Amino acid sequence: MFMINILSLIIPILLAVAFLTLVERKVLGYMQLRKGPNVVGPYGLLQPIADALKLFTKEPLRPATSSISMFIIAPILALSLALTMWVPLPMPYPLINMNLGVLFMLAMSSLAVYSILWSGWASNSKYALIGALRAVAQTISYEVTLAIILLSVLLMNGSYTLSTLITTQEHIWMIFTSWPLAMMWFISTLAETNRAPFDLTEGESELVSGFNVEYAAGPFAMFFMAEYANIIMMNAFTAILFLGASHDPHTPELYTINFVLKTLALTITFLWIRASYPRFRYDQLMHLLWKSFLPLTLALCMWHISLPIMTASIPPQS
Amino acid sequence: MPLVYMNIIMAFAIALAGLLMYRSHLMSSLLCLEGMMLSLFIMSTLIILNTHFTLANMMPIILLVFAACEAALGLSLLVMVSNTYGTDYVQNLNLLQC
Amino acid sequence: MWFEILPGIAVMAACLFIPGMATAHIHKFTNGGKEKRVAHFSYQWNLMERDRCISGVNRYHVTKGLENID
Amino acid sequence: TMYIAFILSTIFVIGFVGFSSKPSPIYGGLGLIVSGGVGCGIVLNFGGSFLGLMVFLIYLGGMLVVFGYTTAMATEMYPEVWVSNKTVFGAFVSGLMMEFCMVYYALKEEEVEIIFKFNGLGDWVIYDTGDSGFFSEEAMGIAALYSYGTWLVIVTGWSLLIGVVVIMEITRGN
Amino acid sequence: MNPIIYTTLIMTVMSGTMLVMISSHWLLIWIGFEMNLLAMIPVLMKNFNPRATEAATKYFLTQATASMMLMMAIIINLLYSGQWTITKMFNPVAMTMMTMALAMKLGLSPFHFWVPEVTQGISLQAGLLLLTWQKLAPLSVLCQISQSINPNLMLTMAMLSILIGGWGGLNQTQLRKIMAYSSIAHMGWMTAVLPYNTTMTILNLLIYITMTLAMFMLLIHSSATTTLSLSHTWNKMPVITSLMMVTLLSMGGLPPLSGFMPKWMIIQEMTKNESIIMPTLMAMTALLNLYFYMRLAYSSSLTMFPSTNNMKMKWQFEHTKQMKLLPTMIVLSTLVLPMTPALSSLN
Amino acid sequence: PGIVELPTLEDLKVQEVKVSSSVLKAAAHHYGAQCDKPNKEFMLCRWEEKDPRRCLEEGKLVNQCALDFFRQIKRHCAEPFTEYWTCIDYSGLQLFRHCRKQQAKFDECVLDKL
Amino acid sequence: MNIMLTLLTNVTLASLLVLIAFWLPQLNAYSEKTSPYECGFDPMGSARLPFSMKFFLVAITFLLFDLEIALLLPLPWASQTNNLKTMLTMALFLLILLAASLAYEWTQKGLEWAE
Amino acid sequence: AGRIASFLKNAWAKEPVLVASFAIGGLAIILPSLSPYTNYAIRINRATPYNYPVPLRDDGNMPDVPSHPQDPQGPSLEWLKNL
Numbered sequence A: 001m002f003m004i005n006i007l008s009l010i011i012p013i014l015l016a017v018a019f020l021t022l023v024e025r026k027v028l029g030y031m032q033l034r035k036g037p038n039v040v041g042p043y044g045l046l047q048p049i050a051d052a053l054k055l056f057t058k059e060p061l062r063p064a065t066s067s068i069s070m071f072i073i074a075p076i077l078a079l080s081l082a083l084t085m086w087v088p089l090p091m092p093y094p095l096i097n098m099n100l101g102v103l104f105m106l107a108m109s110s111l112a113v114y115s116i117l118w119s120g121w122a123s124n125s126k127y128a129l130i131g132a133l134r135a136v137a138q139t140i141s142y143e144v145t146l147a148i149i150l151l152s153v154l155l156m157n158g159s160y161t162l163s164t165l166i167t168t169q170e171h172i173w174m175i176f177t178s179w180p181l182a183m184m185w186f187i188s189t190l191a192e193t194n195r196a197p198f199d200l201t202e203g204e205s206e207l208v209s210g211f212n213v214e215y216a217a218g219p220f221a222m223f224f225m226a227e228y229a230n231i232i233m234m235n236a237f238t239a240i241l242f243l244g245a246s247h248d249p250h251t252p253e254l255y256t257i258n259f260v261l262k263t264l265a266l267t268i269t270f271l272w273i274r275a276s277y278p279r280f281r282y283d284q285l286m287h288l289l290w291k292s293f294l295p296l297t298l299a300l301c302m303w304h305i306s307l308p309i310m311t312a313s314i315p316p317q318s
Numbered sequence B: 001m002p003l004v005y006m007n008i009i010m011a012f013a014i015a016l017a018g019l020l021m022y023r024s025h026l027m028s029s030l031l032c033l034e035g036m037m038l039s040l041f042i043m044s045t046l047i048i049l050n051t052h053f054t055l056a057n058m059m060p061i062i063l064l065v066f067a068a069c070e071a072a073l074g075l076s077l078l079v080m081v082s083n084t085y086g087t088d089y090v091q092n093l094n095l096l097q098c
Numbered sequence C: 001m002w003f004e005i006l007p008g009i010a011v012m013a014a015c016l017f018i019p020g021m022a023t024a025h026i027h028k029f030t031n032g033g034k035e036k037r038v039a040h041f042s043y044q045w046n047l048m049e050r051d052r053c054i055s056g057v058n059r060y061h062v063t064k065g066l067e068n069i070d
Numbered sequence D: 001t002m003y004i005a006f007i008l009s010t011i012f013v014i015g016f017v018g019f020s021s022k023p024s025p026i027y028g029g030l031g032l033i034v035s036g037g038v039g040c041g042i043v044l045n046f047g048g049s050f051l052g053l054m055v056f057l058i059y060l061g062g063m064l065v066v067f068g069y070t071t072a073m074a075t076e077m078y079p080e081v082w083v084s085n086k087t088v089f090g091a092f093v094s095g096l097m098m099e100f101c102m103v104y105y106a107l108k109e110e111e112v113e114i115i116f117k118f119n120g121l122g123d124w125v126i127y128d129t130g131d132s133g134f135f136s137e138e139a140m141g142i143a144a145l146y147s148y149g150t151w152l153v154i155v156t157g158w159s160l161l162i163g164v165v166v167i168m169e170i171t172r173g174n
Numbered sequence E: 001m002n003p004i005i006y007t008t009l010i011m012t013v014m015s016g017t018m019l020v021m022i023s024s025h026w027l028l029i030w031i032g033f034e035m036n037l038l039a040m041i042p043v044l045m046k047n048f049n050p051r052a053t054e055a056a057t058k059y060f061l062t063q064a065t066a067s068m069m070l071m072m073a074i075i076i077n078l079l080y081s082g083q084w085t086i087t088k089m090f091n092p093v094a095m096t097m098m099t100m101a102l103a104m105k106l107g108l109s110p111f112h113f114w115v116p117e118v119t120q121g122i123s124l125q126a127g128l129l130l131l132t133w134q135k136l137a138p139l140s141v142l143c144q145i146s147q148s149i150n151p152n153l154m155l156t157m158a159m160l161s162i163l164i165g166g167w168g169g170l171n172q173t174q175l176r177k178i179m180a181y182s183s184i185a186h187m188g189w190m191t192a193v194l195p196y197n198t199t200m201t202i203l204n205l206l207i208y209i210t211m212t213l214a215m216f217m218l219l220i221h222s223s224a225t226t227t228l229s230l231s232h233t234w235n236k237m238p239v240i241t242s243l244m245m246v247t248l249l250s251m252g253g254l255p256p257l258s259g260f261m262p263k264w265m266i267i268q269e270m271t272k273n274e275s276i277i278m279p280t281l282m283a284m285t286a287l288l289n290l291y292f293y294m295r296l297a298y299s300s301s302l303t304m305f306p307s308t309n310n311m312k313m314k315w316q317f318e319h320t321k322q323m324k325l326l327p328t329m330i331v332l333s334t335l336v337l338p339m340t341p342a343l344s345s346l347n
Numbered sequence F: 001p002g003i004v005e006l007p008t009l010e011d012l013k014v015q016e017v018k019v020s021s022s023v024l025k026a027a028a029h030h031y032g033a034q035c036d037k038p039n040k041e042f043m044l045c046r047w048e049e050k051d052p053r054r055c056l057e058e059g060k061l062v063n064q065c066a067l068d069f070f071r072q073i074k075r076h077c078a079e080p081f082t083e084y085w086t087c088i089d090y091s092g093l094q095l096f097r098h099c100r101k102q103q104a105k106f107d108e109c110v111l112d113k114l
Numbered sequence G: 001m002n003i004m005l006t007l008l009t010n011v012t013l014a015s016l017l018v019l020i021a022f023w024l025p026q027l028n029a030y031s032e033k034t035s036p037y038e039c040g041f042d043p044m045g046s047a048r049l050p051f052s053m054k055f056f057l058v059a060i061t062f063l064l065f066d067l068e069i070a071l072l073l074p075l076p077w078a079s080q081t082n083n084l085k086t087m088l089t090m091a092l093f094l095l096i097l098l099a100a101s102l103a104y105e106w107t108q109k110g111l112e113w114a115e
Numbered sequence H: 001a002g003r004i005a006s007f008l009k010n011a012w013a014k015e016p017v018l019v020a021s022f023a024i025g026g027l028a029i030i031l032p033s034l035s036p037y038t039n040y041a042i043r044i045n046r047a048t049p050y051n052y053p054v055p056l057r058d059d060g061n062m063p064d065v066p067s068h069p070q071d072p073q074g075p076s077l078e079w080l081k082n083l
């Protein structure tokens, strides 16, 4: 029955990823005064299916200069970690209920970094190497800021358990409590998922497709699926962390509907941002986090350590 | 003593023998140095968790902190050596003799 | 017009409904129609083990009461 | 029993054999990452979830810098892999053979090394029967770093600040 | 390097050593060693050149390896006893690891090569600090754990140190490498007496530190780093050469100078424990150190080497900076033999 | 060295309290208030003797008090108690916060009947 | 156990996708198709040559600050102690020293990329 | 004072992020020492029963130790009840 639950967590996520690709194309089209896909199926509903079939029936090639073992492992690692990030999320009941559900997320994201590095290095091309090193710098900056912000917000919670996050947000929203950390968290999640204005690992204008320039057919589709799954997962985590839905134990479908609606709102906001803004320079991205976010993040961490003590509102440990 | 402790001590010995046997790169020896502290961390936490030494649980964290300080120091020295000689090879550190 | 985006969002939402509802239904199915027991600590785990022992069917969710004490 | 801790310890030793055979810093980092994750698993089984996740996260962050440094400082035309070189393959095979020999001897009989005496039995056997209640002993002991261990915080913070000063000073040049 | 940063790094080195000396916890002792090394690397690299960078790299590698072995010994001891306090170690394997690590830190043979290499790499001030303070800390740890030291291992490493120091110093012609090999030999003497009387170890440490400070400060005053550079000092300041000659005689262990007191006390103390072959071999091997000290004394003071023509301008000018406590170090390193029974105060 | 002494299986026998954790948690405050004295005696014995074998009779008395308390509840307030612990048993964490009405009914029943 | 099964399932699904990708389609390989990509012309050098990193100091500072945040992570449990004043003092001490490190590097120009 | 005002106005026009950071940090350092609820937080932490309250052996000379949990003697959490 647990295997059935694993399948029920995996397959709908992949389907949601395909239709997120469709939704992004259509949303960008309408924000750019176009229409987007509306020919392949009714309102372009079969477009993700057509693209997936085409990619997995096209020929994948291994470059003559590539290191084949880590050329293959990198998409496997990316997609496996993308599917793994979903197991501790409470919707409202996690598939795997972890005592430290947040540190697991941080560790698995830090591991999922290395798929980009190894795919860029194993490809043995200059554009791939440049994309890999852009990933290195991006991870430096966003990682330090993300860890401090998570520490502060979960300090308002009492523990690292996401069900406890639901219980904490029973009455109001953590975004009402801590909106500055919410803004910096949203920007950091953009940088972490490599979304515009921070899509520097795969920057088409500067690098020809960045780190996955040498990838074709199926192995490219795996990177695409992993990236979009990470987008949805990070928005789901943000919704759980800052926009806490009401939970009724006898009818848990209401929490699921609220959670899905909030997640979709955040994902569509990601697409909106991509349509609206230019692209950063990765040195300016590093200088943004360290010279702007890190001081405010440290000050807010001090503030959110002191605030429960000075007001006698320290959360319960369990 | 369980076989787990034997394996952890064996990993430490392997990482120590790796450090003491340079090949060409200074970076590989630094990685061997980082493995030794990882094995030390694992051994210490296995010993502490088994014995319920509650106040000693913070010791592996301090161990990690000073591992980080050592790694930072080694990387700084490596960049200086590479700036001087063009490569991180240990054969270039031969100006001084015994 | 802009409402032609909605069917794709509807499909994506329907896909995101499946995991949570499926997990809730499977939790209730394998725990006798009740919430799956959360055991974050040794005390809660020991309570679950004692419930398994007293049930007589090697299942913690089979709850026994006054009709069982007498 | 399931020997999960023993299997994980063996994988830990294998990763150490890899990065100590030292193919090239890319694959050395790969082996070190594998060993870090496997050690996280070992200590998760033994009880310390925070310690496992923390060491895994710290080594994931540390090896990210090592990749960027070996791309810049420690790279050559044809990076060496385990089968690419005779010395690297020889050392890797020697380490694997030594691990296999010691594992086999320990499983077949209570192996006393020339250094320590080891008994081949249950890692589950060595565990303790007692339990805590409504708190994690590991979490409380780690959180005692701020109530207790004021001296440790002071020396650690001083060391980190001086470490920043040192790395800035070493790389000054001129 | 900024003067403020330099003095804060010196204070951090001293703080690490003091933490090692005052701690009662093995973790805190390890932390002190780590802090000392971390703040000590930039001091070696203070004057940037490839030789300084190489010396700092070699010193870092050796000290990191030694600290790793020390922590392994600490953890092994904790495994078999559950004790974090620094006392007699409860495992012979842990004790052997600890002895190897502390010997590698001190430069006892066969862990000595880094000593001449690093000392030649770094400047005179950095070498002075290195020898003095970085011998000061591990010896305190060894004195604390002396009652579990393996006499065979300790005495083997001590005799190896004495022999290696004598021979290397015989070959060397650079002043810093001469000082390094002399340091190796003196560490040999101290650790030879260590398993019998830590008081005699401390006495030898103090006398060695005084003689080394006087010698290094005389070299700094004369700005001489080679034999031939030091051969010009008689034509600029003949007093410094004479003081250096008396200090060299003291270091060689000639009576009635202060260098005879540690050798005398150590020979006596080891003889009390029915050791005769070891003190006799140690006393005979010091003749090598005396030989290369005397070779250095011939070039600088007892003979007048040729000089150059710009020495006249050097005559016209005067030395500006004043060494702190140089006269006191000169006197203490040569004339305190009649004050020997104060080692009881040292006790 | 010596041979450990173990109580026989005959004197380890006692009437077990075969209710579930939800049932126990529902009647936990009233149980702690009513059967305080035997439990405190047993806990003092356990902490002073530091030996399971030296406090077996106190354990028997603890079980006897628990059974008497539950029989007394079963004789008077069986239905409100069943509703209350049925409400508690649903929660995965067994929360008191979600069953305040049933708790109120049970507290009213035991305040009047007992 | 369940987490191991989940990891195995994810890895197996990804590996099956790779296997289908590399074995289902028709393959035609020749030396020109598999050559490295550099916008239509041949690469002058090699992609394995050293690649200068202009932010080498920020990486070392990242290592140190990463372990600072490792120290800071157990704060949620530290707030349950009776020694609230000591806990608050030490937490603020660590954060202030982290801020001091950032300020020192910023003013000494450690955050500026090499030219 | 005028120099202080000029410096603050310049910083607020050039580095509002740094001005906000220092203001938040300074308030975080200072406010807990002035808040009357720090002692309440300490008391709430002390009032949490993590482990079992082992009873004392009655010597007959313990008038402040209750014989029953519901006896008037012993600590009271009525302050926390209305808080």
Ligand SMILES: CCCCCCCCCCCCCCCCCC(=O)OC[C@H](COP(=O)([O-])OCC[N+](C)(C)C)OC(=O)CCCCCCCCCCCCCCCCC
Residues within 6 Å of the ligand: A073, A076, A077, A080, A081, A097, A098, A099, A100, A104, C039, C040, C041, D037, D038, D040, D041, D042, D044, D045, D049, D050, G001, G003, G004, G005, G007, G008, G011
């Ligand atoms: C049957 C499966 C066979 C294959 C298994 C393969 C496993 C490989 C990884 C080994 C290490 C992780 C598992 C350790 C054993 C179980 C630990 C355990 O009990 O955890 C419970 C704990 C429970 O969480 P907790 O912290 O809440 O626990 C306390 C609460 N109680 C006690 C009530 C449960 O799980 C975790 O904490 C999750 C941590 C997962 C850490 C994973 C680290 C390694 C990641 C490797 C990623 C590889 C990706 C794929 C790469 C492919 C490349 C080609």
Ligand SMILES: CCCCCCCCCCCCCCCCCC(=O)OC[C@H](COP(=O)([O-])OCC[N+](C)(C)C)OC(=O)CCCCCCCCCCCCCCCCC
Residues within 6 Å of the ligand: A169, A170, A171, A172, A173, A175, A176, A179, A243, A244, A245, A246, A247, A258, A261, A262, A265
């Ligand atoms: C400087 C400005 C700072 C602004 C900080 C606040 C930013 C808020 C950003 C919200 C983004 C929402 C994205 C997802 C949208 C989901 C829509 C949805 O399902 O809504 C139905 C949902 C209902 O589903 P629900 O169950 O999740 O909502 C209640 C959730 N509980 C009670 C569990 C916390 O929300 C509502 O209908 C009410 C929302 C507010 C709930 C909090 C209590 C009331 C607070 C009132 C005072 C507000 C003061 C500030 C107002 C002005 C701010 C500028």
Ligand SMILES: CCCCCCCCCCCCCCCCCC(=O)OC[C@H](COP(=O)([O-])OCC[N+](C)(C)C)OC(=O)CCCCCCCCCCCCCCCCC
Residues within 6 Å of the ligand: A052, A053, A056, A057, G020, G024, G025, G026
């Ligand atoms: C969406 C993500 C997952 C994707 C999974 C797969 C999606 C696609 C499913 C339908 C595929 C239909 C077959 C396409 C095969 C490639 C076509 C091709 O190469 O044609 C040229 C070649 C032409 O061969 P030829 O012999 O004429 O050519 C000789 C070579 N030249 C060109 C030089 C003259 O076609 C074949 O070789 C035909 C092989 C058999 C085709 C049918 C077998 C596959 C059946 C698939 C059923 C589904 C289950 C199994 C597949 C995996 C999924 C679980």
Ligand SMILES: CCCCCCCC/C=C/CCCCCCCC(=O)OC[C@H](COP(=O)(O)OCCN)OC(=O)CCCCCCC/C=C/CCCCCCCC
Residues within 6 Å of the ligand: D161, D165, E008, G089, G092, G093, G096, G097, G099, G100, G101, G103, G104, G107, H029
């Ligand atoms: C805690 C710091 C003191 C530690 C001293 C260690 C030895 C010295 C080594 C340096 C470490 C500290 C260096 C930090 C200051 C160096 C940077 C500097 O010089 O300027 C600071 C810079 C000033 O800007 P300008 O110089 O004008 O440059 C802009 C030009 N347009 O900004 C600062 O002042 C930041 C200083 C540190 C920020 C934190 C302030 C700490 C105040 C809180 C009290 C700390 C008490 C510690 C106990 C805490 C108890 C809760």
Ligand SMILES: CCCCCCCCCCCCCCCCCC(=O)OC[C@H](COP(=O)(O)OCCN)OC(=O)CCCCCCCCCCCCCCCCC
Residues within 6 Å of the ligand: E323, E324, E325, E326, E328
């Ligand atoms: C407790 C700390 C002890 C050490 C302190 C050393 C400080 C001075 C270091 C520099 C070298 C010695 C001084 C040489 C002259 C320097 C230039 C000069 O003209 O100095 C004038 C100075 C006048 O003395 P003044 O400074 O007024 O005395 C202290 C007042 N608070 O003239 C003098 O001070 C000259 C006399 C100096 C004191 C004699 C030397 C040290 C005596 C130590 C006695 C114990 C013996 C063992 C010593 C072991 C090593 C310390």
